[PDB]
Write a protein that binds this ligand. Structure first.
Ligand SMILES: CCc1cccc2c(C3CCNCC3)c[nH]c12
Ligand SMILES: CCc1cccc2c(C3CCNCC3)c[nH]c12
Ligand SMILES: [Zn+2]
Length: 195
């Protein structure tokens, strides 16, 4: 009834990477290693790097899923709020209820789990472009952390899993997410609070 969040590199040495975008007021997406937390604006591009030590097999996929970070909310499905699920902003592929979208990948598949009712989005794992050392997936988060009737100011985690063609686990990584109007300011504030 709750997805595992345990970091697991597995046989291929799977882990995530993030750009260094800084904390200027104008920044739209920024990652805090000290907090393991991504701060981003609504529906803006969030580049996430996929690193392995060796190439996994053809048919390997990469899934993203959100869960609530607090234990007392973790069995609740993370979904878009009653406003945003009705604002008709679909890309023609993502169901309007899904918080997490993949941008610019026509092979993205969106799952509503028949047993758990959780949402996820999965894409084929592709090797890096010639000249690149990793593959980047572009995610969008489609509600604010503060949306009433949705996340309702509750923190979430994104869990990224590397899966074989059957959906079996090959690797797992995760990060906290705050979707907010001013990611740069909020990252600076939370990093200072931590210090
Ligand atoms: C990373 C999964 C993948 C995609 C496309 C081709 C290959 C080969 C060859 C190994 N693995 C692959
Ligand atoms: C997970 C995405 C992905 C698929 C296949 C290969 C890679 C690499 C490296 C692995 C070591 N040799 C160069 C590509 C980073 N990321 C990958
Ligand atoms: Zn919302």
């Amino acid at each position: 009834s709750v997805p595992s969040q345990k970091t697991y590199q597995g046989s291929y040495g799977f882990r995530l990477g993030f750009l260094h975008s800084g904390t200027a007021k104008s920044v739209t997406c920024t990652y805090s290693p000290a907090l393991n937390k991504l701060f981003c604006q609504l529906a803006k591009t969030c580049p996430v790097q996929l690193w392995v030590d060796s190439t996994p097999p053809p048919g390997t996929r990469v899934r993203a899923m959100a869960i609530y970070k607090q234990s007392q909310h973790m069995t609740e499905v993370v979904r878009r709020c009653p406003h945003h699920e009705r604002c008709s902003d679909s890309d023609g592929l993502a169901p309007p209820q899904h918080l997490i979208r993949v941008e610019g990948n026509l092979r993205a598949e969106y799952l509503d789990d028949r047993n758990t009712f959780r949402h996820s989005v999965v894409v084929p794992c592709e090797p890096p472009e010639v000249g690149s050392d990793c593959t980047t997936i572009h995610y969008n988060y489609m509600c604010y952390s503060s949306c009433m009737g949705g996340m309702n100011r509750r923190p979430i985690l994104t869990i990224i899993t590397l899966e074989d063609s059957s959906g079996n686990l090959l690797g797992r990584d995760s990060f906290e997410v705050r979707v907010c109007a001013c990611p740069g300011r909020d990252r600076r504030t939370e990093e200072e609070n931590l210090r």
